[PDB]
Amino acid sequence: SAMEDFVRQCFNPMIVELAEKAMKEYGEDPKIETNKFAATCTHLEVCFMYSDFGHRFEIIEGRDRIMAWTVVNSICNTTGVEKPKFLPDLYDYKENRFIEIGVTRREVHIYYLEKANKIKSEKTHIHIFSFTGEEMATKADYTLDEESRARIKTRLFTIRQEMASRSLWDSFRQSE
Ligand SMILES: [Mn+2]
Ligand SMILES: [Mn+2]
Known part of the structure; x- marks a missing residue:
């Protein structure tokens, strides 16, 4: 497919391999669900970018569930920040809060409302990015x-x- 080929051209191998691992974690073929494959790569890359700005951030996204919850539990035990219901994407050691990262092809406010309604935690900080800046x-x-x-x-x-x-x-963009 052209979309799978694009994903392997534009993302680095480490990101592609992590994205394939996630796709398998929800039993999805990246050769079939090619738009989800690209979205997964993009979200991974944004999270790793966001974290490279420390030191300041601990990356939770891109880990296997066991290690992700291991990191979350260790953070909650050393900070007293309460455990989120759902795996967040990052932990901010400066503001001392978990961050959920969203990347959307829709209006940022619509996706923000969706993410906020799902996580239902006033503690987990939400940061939504679009493809339009x-x-x-x-x-x-x-x-x-x-x-x-x-x-x-x-x-x-x-x-x-x-x-x-x-x-x-x-x-x-028309896929979700
Ligand atoms: Mn996540
Ligand atoms: Mn996210």
């Missing part, structure tokens, strides 16, 4: 400095334009 965060606290958020938004927009150059963006 838009962002929305809990209490409009964007956590990072503008340069770091700028590099995330540039990478996301670049992924979108590469898809578009291969006529893959319309499929990807």
Whole structure:
């Protein structure tokens, strides 16, 4: 498929392999669910980017469930922050809060409402990125400095334009 080929062209091997591991964790073939494959790669890369801005962040996303919950439990035991219902994506050691990262092909406010309604925790900070350079965060606290958020938004927009150059963006954006 063209979408699978794009995913292997634009993401680094480590990210692709982690994404395939996740797809198997919910029993999904990346050769069939190619838009989910690309979305999974994109979310992984954003989380790793977000974390590289420390030191400051602990990455939970990209780990197997056992190690992810091991990290979460160790953090909660050393900080007293309460355990989230659902696996978050990062832990911010400076603000001392868990962060759930969203990347959406829709309006940032719609996806923010969806994520907030799901997690149902006033403790887990939400930060939504779009492929159009838009962002929305809990209490409009964007956590990072503008340069770091700028590099995330540039990478996301670049992924979108590469898809578009291969006529893959319309499929990807209409998929959820
Ligand atoms: Mn996650
Ligand atoms: Mn997320």
